[PDB]
Amino acid sequence: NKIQQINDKELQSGILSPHQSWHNEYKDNAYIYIGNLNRELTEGDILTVFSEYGVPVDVILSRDENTGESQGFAYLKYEDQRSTILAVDNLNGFKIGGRALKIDHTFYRPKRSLQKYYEAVKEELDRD
RNA sequence: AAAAAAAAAAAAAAAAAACUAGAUACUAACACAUUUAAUUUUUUUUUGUU
DSSP states (O other): OOHHHHHHHHHHHOOGGGGGGGGGGGHHHHHHEEOOOSSSSSSHHHHHHTTTSSSSEEEEEEEEETTOOOEEEEEEESTTTTHHHHHHHOOOOOOOOEOOOEEEEOOOOOGGGGHHHHHHHHHHHHHO
């Protein structure tokens, strides 16, 4: 609802196409921060809503090291960037499970401690 | 220009109020297009990763 507020102003001026859009600030980014998730949605189900706008190559759900349950945020890289422009813009502010999730562009830095979680995820997304 | 008179009835201290609706004049240099670049409507069960 912070970002959703911008695009309405922006589109109203007829900004139309990325060169003039703030989404142009990125261009080298693909992962999207996915916020305000519900707690029970897992990686496979976050890999439900987000293929509407593209083809995910990677995904990471943030979850406590001990109890292993959702922190409530994820980082999902689309194969073709412009999905990111599409997901951030279009699906931000949308309700799942009563709470409206947030998306925004992100630069994502991998953490050693999850290293196995990368192949464990990749192998599934490597199936396709 | 100009040269009077005379025969014992009256007097007066100068319409409202209320009700309900309608009719028309009028009063305040009243206000009538700019208003928006520091500052509080922005609210949620804390939860954005070398």
